[PDB]
Amino acid sequence: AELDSLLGQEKERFQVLPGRDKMLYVAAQNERDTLWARQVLARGDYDKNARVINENEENKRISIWLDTYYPQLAYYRIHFDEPRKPVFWLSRQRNTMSKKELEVLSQKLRALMPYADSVNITLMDDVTAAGQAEAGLKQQALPYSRRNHKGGVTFVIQGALDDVEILRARQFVDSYYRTWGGRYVQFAIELKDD
Amino acid sequence: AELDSLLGQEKERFQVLPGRDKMLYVAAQNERDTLWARQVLARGDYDKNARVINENEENKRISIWLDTYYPQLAYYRIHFDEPRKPVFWLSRQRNTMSKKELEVLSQKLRALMPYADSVNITLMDDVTAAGQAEAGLKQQALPYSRRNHKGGVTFVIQGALDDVEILRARQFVDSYYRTWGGRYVQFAIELKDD
Amino acid sequence: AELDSLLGQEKERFQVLPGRDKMLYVAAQNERDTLWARQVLARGDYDKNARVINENEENKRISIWLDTYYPQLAYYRIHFDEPRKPVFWLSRQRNTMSKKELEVLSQKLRALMPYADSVNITLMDDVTAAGQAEAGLKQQALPYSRRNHKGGVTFVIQGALDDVEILRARQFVDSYYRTWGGRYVQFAIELKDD
Amino acid sequence: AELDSLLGQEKERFQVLPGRDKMLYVAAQNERDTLWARQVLARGDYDKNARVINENEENKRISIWLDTYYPQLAYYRIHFDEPRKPVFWLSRQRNTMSKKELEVLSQKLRALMPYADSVNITLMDDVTAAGQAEAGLKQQALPYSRRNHKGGVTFVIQGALDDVEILRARQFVDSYYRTWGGRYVQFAIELKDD
Amino acid sequence: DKDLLKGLDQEQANEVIAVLQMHNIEANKIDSGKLGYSITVAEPDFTAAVYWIKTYQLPPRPRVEIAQMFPADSLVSSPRAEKARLYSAIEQRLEQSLQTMEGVLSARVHISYDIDAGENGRPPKPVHLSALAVYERGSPLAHQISDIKRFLKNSFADVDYDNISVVLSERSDAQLQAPGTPVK
Amino acid sequence: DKDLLKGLDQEQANEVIAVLQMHNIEANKIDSGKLGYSITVAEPDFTAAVYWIKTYQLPPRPRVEIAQMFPADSLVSSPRAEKARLYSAIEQRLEQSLQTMEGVLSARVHISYDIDAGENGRPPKPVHLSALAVYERGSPLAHQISDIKRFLKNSFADVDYDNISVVLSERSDAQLQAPGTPVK
Amino acid sequence: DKDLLKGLDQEQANEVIAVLQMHNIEANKIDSGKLGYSITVAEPDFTAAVYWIKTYQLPPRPRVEIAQMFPADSLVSSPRAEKARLYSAIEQRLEQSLQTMEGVLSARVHISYDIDAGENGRPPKPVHLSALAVYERGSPLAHQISDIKRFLKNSFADVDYDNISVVLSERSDAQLQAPGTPVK
Amino acid sequence: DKDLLKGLDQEQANEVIAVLQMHNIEANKIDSGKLGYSITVAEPDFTAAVYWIKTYQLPPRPRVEIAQMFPADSLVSSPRAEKARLYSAIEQRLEQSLQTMEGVLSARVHISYDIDAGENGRPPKPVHLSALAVYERGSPLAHQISDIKRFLKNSFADVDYDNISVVLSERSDAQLQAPGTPVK
């Protein structure tokens, strides 16, 4: 019962990974495919440890552990893209960890990810994160008020909104979140009467 | 009747632990799984001492004993994460216990946890706990009033609230609680007319 | 008919104790379990003296005897926790008993508890009892007025109350009572119109 | 079951491509044909890796990867036209990459496109992009207000609009988008009361 | 082998049994067809069983709703009756809604009534609401209460945060174990 | 092999079963034709099964809608009744609409009523709306709430952003695994 | 081989099946003639199937339209009823029109009602409109929304661009693949 | 060999088939006489077929026209009903006219209604018109729109060029090729 044949006809929707922990992993790109694969494991059978991977769920799982063991660590989001070598965005300006400490950190992350062979920790500039957030926001001709504070920035959008600008606002926000994540830049859409 | 086969199809939802007291423990990550396992023990059978573990229930059990034998001890929350070696957050600034006294304390905690091999007591800085509480709170653009007092801090949120900011407020509070616990930082959401 | 098999499937809900008076005791942690065990003794059978133990009922039984033979004794609450060696909280500041007198006192308490092997009498500081009562009370952002008087302190809570603060108030009070007892600190919640 | 015979009667609607990854690709020029081909793959059969190509979907797939590995890269749109050698429009004025760096970039793009033999990266002048946007817009006799900002330009169209000018406006915008893409020039049609 | 209750309907039978089991008493449910259900117990428990039937007012009465006393079968109607009927339905509908919220196991809703404001030439009074709720054990009740209150606030023409009261708690330790038989 | 429930309709039967499975209890659905459905459970689980029937108020009651108490079969009608009937339909229609939005699994809608404004010589009051919603797990609820609110705002004669309340969440971890049989 | 649903009409049967397939569950549609349709599933999936029936409120209810509560069969009529009937028809007719626009797969339309303006000696209120729409995936929604809004603006006596709300999106990834059978 | 739809009328049957073919699905139309038409599909396509039936709200509903709710069979009539009946006919007649213009394949027309101007002692409101149109592909839509607008302007008592809205487009690439059978 080869797992590849157990999964749907369009086998290219899933990336099967062979974890060093003897668990065969199923990387899915969407929660509909996540559920699909989970139903396969519960419905059919495969005599071997197995577990479905979901980019957001894994990002969260890691962030939980990470907060406990490395509290106050300033970071953005893990980009899984190529399962084998996920990229860890780390705040360049807020973290003062030494190279050796960063080595250790990546090793702990490798422990958290049975499939990943290595972790590419890289430092990102907080300014460029904020710059992109605001630039795109004003490109869309949206009204807003920026809130700089220690440790982050919030973009407040208030007042009555036109259905067109509402659509535009959400599209922008979702994309920003998908890329950078919501740990530094926080958006605040508030539909109110004037 | 191996317990692993007695528990659900997705065996990875539970972590079976072998306590030194001859009791086989079932660590569950959610009250739905807690109940699942309890029903297994009552429905089926297994000729051996057994007991289902729940992170919050154990945190509470310990805190009860701990208050009786170590009254006035200033602490936060036990992070079970890796069953074998749970982490005990202790107030760095409020406690003045000696290293030897802390050794004894960890030994008593080991007695309270039949499965745990050792206890990692570590000291946390009260300031950073409070700092994170307020920082995230204001990042969410929430209105509040801080109440510093000897032994703790309370964040009061009053007035009429927009459904959007209500949602945001709760999400933040739940996460803070999950991490640090509610022994130092207390939140007070009060939905009132203006 | 071994008592352990006579009691419920989850035998870990009860602690069977072998009293020196030839009575087999059943320690229960909750009145539902207290009743459970009592029904077992009345429904089934066991050819031997037996008696169900309840932490609060025993605390009360002792306090009755204690008031008659040691009137004016200033004390808080007996912590049964580990049946064998219950802890007796005694007012450090109000009692002036000699070490020898305290020895005798513990011996009388041992007589009152057929199962207990010894009694750990310890002296508590009245100030810390009061301090905790007020500290937690104000941490919860509750309105109150303290009433210090010779022999005790009362915390008066009047006025109209928000359903949220009502819940918080009770939770706090119940916990304080459970730990210290209501012999020194008295709470007085009075829901009234303004 | 030659794929050419599996696809519709008018075989000239599709361009079958032989990827170096052993996947036979089906290039479609329209989402109706995209779906057609996908239904063929799911309905019928072909013993070989296969995947339907869609110009917009591929443009998006690439842009995702590209943003992660080359963040802040200023570019416009990939013109697939002749599958074998797609053209990559790159901002001439905003990018300062060296020739060698551009070589590497094209190589990464080749990796992203299994069928493409090479990638023709070329630099476009931001001024001419903006010039065409405005020129056509005013040629159509449409009212607007230009918004130059760092990194882009937005064309705001407000007020009540005549059904005729509404039609004209959309036709223009769709064509501009199709050619240059919406990464530099953003249009903002807002039908409002005066 | 003693007869405890007879002629019970399905709901009543299951409710009584639940209580007896909770207090460590085994009970038999006997289906007598058109004659309803009967509950019997072991003679050793019978005394205790009787005690608990008394204690908990068993078997349960049918649930009382206001509309049950102002039926549409009447040949005539009155403003008083019609307004009452409407409010009855509204309370029921609000209960149906609260029980779908995350973590809610059970909930009850009350709304104040107005039987003679307009009748006396007077303007209507402010609406008062109250509700009870039971949550899944371990749930953060102290915060959840604000959703209920906000929801109800805009669920009716004219209420406010001082005239809406919510009292709530959470379920007890589930009785997942059988009582067991008598020793003999 | 114990009888738990009898005479259930199709909806009720499936709902009760869902709950039992969620709590690790296998259940049989028996089709007795005109007599309805019956639910039976293994004796080892029976005690727990009863407990949960109590806990979740099972079997479920039929859904309450306002129009059910002001039927068109009446020989006569009144302004009061007719206006109520209309509002009932409107709430239903709004629920039908919200459940078609992307990511919405379930939604409920309430609208305030007006039973005697004009009756008392008074002008009508502002309309209040409230709604509940369940989303597909992982969905960005904090932003989606604004679509609901905007949609409802222009879906009725006179409402505003302060008199529309939306409370929402997302589904739980799907129960995709069978409970399993008892050990024996 | 488990029975899930029985007595379904044609629409309901096909809708439920669509959902089950979407979640990787095979389902059989059985034609029992006058008794309707029945849906059965493989025992391995049955648990999950039940879960989803609950989750999606299945089987679907019939669509609610305002005119259904003010039928022409009545011996008498009232201005209130007649005006309501008209508006109901108008909403339906507008939905029929929007669904013929290029790229639109589905659309729903709501119009505000007026039940007692003239009744109270008052002038009529401005008309509010709202609509939902689903487009073919890949379509330029941000511009298409202006056609809908313009069309509706002159489709009724007195509306404006601030009292017309449009919320829309596009279809998901089409389920073009069969779920597959269980392994055994 | 799966049953998809049954009991279809002629129009519905042909419409559903058109959609399935457009999405590369072969379909059989079976004439069962008095029982209507049935649509069946190949098992390989069945999953996709179901998906599309859902997506496009199939089978189609009957077209809604205002006069259908104010029939001449009524024993009595009212000014309100009669005026509505007239307008309904007028919209239909205008649609019949636009569809005869050169290059027009399909067109729909709406006219605003007046239900209570005179009723309230008020003068009538200006008439609003809106229309949809589909043209032969390649046609110069940007100019053709002016004929429609001019025609409609003098087709009614009191309209103007600001209260007439026309939204239009052209047909898609004709599906002139058969879907084809499954490979087996």
Query: D193 and G136: CB-CB below 8 Å?
Result: no
- B105, B89 contact by CB (below 8 A): no
Distance from the first to the final alpha carbon of chain G: 14
On whether any CB of chain D is under 8 Å from the CB of A138, the answer is yes
In angstroms, rounded to a whole number, what is the distance separating the alpha carbons of residues C111 and B182? 42
- B15, B83 contact by CB (below 8 A): yes
On whether any CB of chain A is under 8 Å from the CB of B135, the answer is yes
In angstroms, rounded to a whole number, what is the distance separating the alpha carbons of residues H53 and H8? 14
Give how far Cα B120 sits from Cα of B27, B70, B89, B103, H38, Å: 19, 17, 9, 10, 72
H131 Cβ contact partners less than 8 Å away, ≥ 6 residues apart:
H98, H107, H108, H109, H110, H148, H152, H164, H165, H166, H167
β-pairing verdict for C87-91 and C120-124: parallel
Q: Which chain D residues are within 8 Å of G146, Cβ to Cβ?
A: 166, 189, 191
On whether any CB of chain A is under 8 Å from the CB of F180, the answer is no
Own/partner pairs for B100-109, CB < 8 Å, 24+ apart? Answer: B105/B70, B108/B69, B109/B62, B109/B66
Nearest CA in chain G to A36: G24
**Helical packing angle, B163-180 and E141-153, nearest 10°:** 170
Please list, residue by residue across G104-142, b when 16 or more beta carbons sit within 10 angstroms of its beta carbon and e when fewer do. bbbbbbbbbbbbbebeeeeebeebbbbbbbbbebebebb
Most H CBs within 10 A among D35, D43, D164, D191, hence the mutation to make, goes to D43
Q: C160, exposed or middle or buried, with CB in 10 Å at 0-12, 13-18, 19+?
A: exposed
Cis peptide before G59 (omega within 30 of 0): yes
Q: C17, exposed or middle or buried, with CB in 10 Å at 0-12, 13-18, 19+?
A: middle
β-pairing verdict for D145-149 and C145-149: unpaired
Nearest to D178 by CA among D62, D85, D89, D73: D89
Q: Which residue has the tokens 């031997």?
A: C48
- F89, E81 contact by CB (below 8 A): no
In angstroms, rounded to a whole number, what is the distance separating the alpha carbons of residues H174 and H136? 11
- Side chain identity at E66, as an amino acid letter? I
Q: H157, exposed or middle or buried, with CB in 10 Å at 0-12, 13-18, 19+?
A: exposed
**Final resolution, Å:** 6.3
Return the beta strands (E) in chain A as ranges: 14-18, 24-28, 50-54, 75-79, 87-91, 120-124, 145-149, 152-159, 185-191
In this structure, what token pair is assigned to residue D31?
Answer: 């989402």
In angstroms, rounded to a whole number, what is the distance separating the alpha carbons of residues F178 and G43? 10
- B37, B29 contact by CB (below 8 A): no
In this structure, what token pair is assigned to residue A7?
Answer: 């999964």
- F98, F131 contact by CB (below 8 A): yes
Strand, helix or coil for residue G68: helix
In angstroms, rounded to a whole number, what is the distance separating the alpha carbons of residues A27 and A52? 6
Question: In the beta sheet, which residues pair with residue D17?
Answer: D25
> Cα distance from D146 to chain A (closest Cα, Å)?
11
Give how far Cα E140 sits from Cα of B124, E54, E168, Å: 25, 35, 11
Query: C179 and B68: CB-CB below 8 Å?
Result: yes
Q: HSE, CB side, 13 Å, CA atoms: give it for residue D9.
A: 8
Strand, helix or coil for residue H123: coil
In this structure, what token pair is assigned to residue D79?
Answer: 């013109």
> CB D95: neighbour CB atoms within 10 A?
15
- F173, G48 contact by CB (below 8 A): no
Q: Which of E142, E178, E184 sits opposite C168 (nearest CB)?
A: E142
Nearest CA in chain B to C178: B64
Q: Which residue has the tokens 């009870």?
A: E132
Q: C60, exposed or middle or buried, with CB in 10 Å at 0-12, 13-18, 19+?
A: exposed
Query: B190 and C164: CB-CB below 8 Å?
Result: yes
On whether any CB of chain F is under 8 Å from the CB of E38, the answer is no
Query: B81 and A68: CB-CB below 8 Å?
Result: yes
Phi, psi (rounded to 5 degrees) for A159:
100, 175
> Cα distance from E1 to chain B (closest Cα, Å)?
27
In this structure, what token pair is assigned to residue E1?
Answer: 């082998």
Radius of gyration in angstroms for the set of CA atoms belonging to chain A, rounded to a whole number: 20
Q: Which of A9, A81, A164 sits opposite D42 (nearest CB)?
A: A9
In angstroms, rounded to a whole number, what is the distance separating the alpha carbons of residues B83 and E141? 28
Q: Which residue has the tokens 């509040």?
A: B144
Strand, helix or coil for residue E14: helix
> CB F69: neighbour CB atoms within 10 A?
21
- Side chain identity at D87, as an amino acid letter? V
Q: Which residue has the tokens 């945190």?
A: B59
Nearest to A29 by CA among A18, A16, A13, A40: A13
In this structure, what token pair is assigned to residue H98?
Answer: 């636009």
Give how far Cα C104 sits from Cα of C63, C70, C97, C107, C111, Å: 16, 11, 10, 5, 11
DSSP code string of chain C: --HHHHS-S-GGGEEEEE-TTS-EEEEESSHHHHHHHHHHHHHS--SS-EEEEEHHHHHHHHHHHHHHHSTT--EEEEE-SSTTS-EEEEETTT----HHHHHHHHHHHHHH-SS-S--EEEEE-HHHHHHHHHHHHHHTT---EEEEETTEEEEEEEE---HHHHHHHHHHHHHHHHHH-SSSEEEEEEE---
Q: Which chain F residues are within 8 Å of G3, Cβ to Cβ?
A: 29, 31
Cis peptide before F44 (omega within 30 of 0): no
Instruction: Give one word for F180, left, alpha or beta, with left for phi > 0 and alpha for psi -120 to 50.
Output: left
- H131, H98 contact by CB (below 8 A): yes
Give how far Cα A102 sits from Cα of A71, A73, A83, G23, G159, Å: 14, 11, 20, 42, 62
Nearest to B115 by CA among B63, B62, B165, B154: B62
Q: Which of A51, A156, A191 sits opposite B12 (nearest CB)?
A: A51
Q: Which residue has the tokens 């995230």?
A: B136
On whether any CB of chain H is under 8 Å from the CB of G112, the answer is no
In angstroms, rounded to a whole number, what is the distance separating the alpha carbons of residues H88 and H90? 5
Q: Which residue has the tokens 């329209």?
A: D30
Cis peptide before D86 (omega within 30 of 0): no
In angstroms, rounded to a whole number, what is the distance separating the alpha carbons of residues H85 and H89? 7
- Side chain identity at C149, as an amino acid letter? H
Strand, helix or coil for residue D60: helix
Q: HSE, CB side, 13 Å, CA atoms: give it for residue B176.
A: 23
For residue G92, the surrounding DSSP H or E stretch is helix G79-98
Question: In the beta sheet, which residues pair with residue C109?
Answer: none
> Cα distance from E45 to chain C (closest Cα, Å)?
6
In angstroms, rounded to a whole number, what is the distance separating the alpha carbons of residues E71 and G46? 43
- A51, A22 contact by CB (below 8 A): no
In this structure, what token pair is assigned to residue H43?
Answer: 């098992």
In angstroms, rounded to a whole number, what is the distance separating the alpha carbons of residues E113 and E125? 9
CB within 8 Å of chain D, chain G residues 146-175: 146-147, 149-150, 160-162, 174
Nearest CA in chain G to D158: G146
In angstroms, rounded to a whole number, what is the distance separating the alpha carbons of residues C175 and C112? 27
> CB F74: neighbour CB atoms within 10 A?
11
Nearest to H24 by CA among F167, F38, B112, D7: D7
In angstroms, rounded to a whole number, what is the distance separating the alpha carbons of residues E178 and F3? 16
Q: HSE, CB side, 13 Å, CA atoms: give it for residue H11.
A: 4
- C156, B162 contact by CB (below 8 A): no
Nearest to E17 by CA among E26, E8, E9: E26
Nearest to B44 by CA among E175, F183, C8, F25: F183
- Side chain identity at D186, as an amino acid letter? Q
Q: B166, exposed or middle or buried, with CB in 10 Å at 0-12, 13-18, 19+?
A: buried
F62 Cβ contact partners less than 8 Å away, ≥ 6 residues apart:
none
H168 Cβ contact partners less than 8 Å away, ≥ 6 residues apart:
D167, H132, H133, H134, H135, H141, H144, H145, H148
Nearest to D171 by CA among A165, G103, H169, G102: H169
In angstroms, rounded to a whole number, what is the distance separating the alpha carbons of residues F112 and H75? 37
In angstroms, rounded to a whole number, what is the distance separating the alpha carbons of residues C52 and C45? 14
Question: In the beta sheet, which residues pair with residue A188?
Answer: A156
β-pairing verdict for A24-28 and A14-18: antiparallel
Strand, helix or coil for residue B145: strand
> CB F178: neighbour CB atoms within 10 A?
18
D142 Cβ contact partners less than 8 Å away, ≥ 6 residues apart:
D157, D165, D168, D169, D172
In angstroms, rounded to a whole number, what is the distance separating the alpha carbons of residues D79 and F127? 53
Question: In the beta sheet, which residues pair with residue F133?
Answer: F107, F168
Q: Which residue has the tokens 């894994």?
A: A58
In angstroms, rounded to a whole number, what is the distance separating the alpha carbons of residues D78 and D76? 7
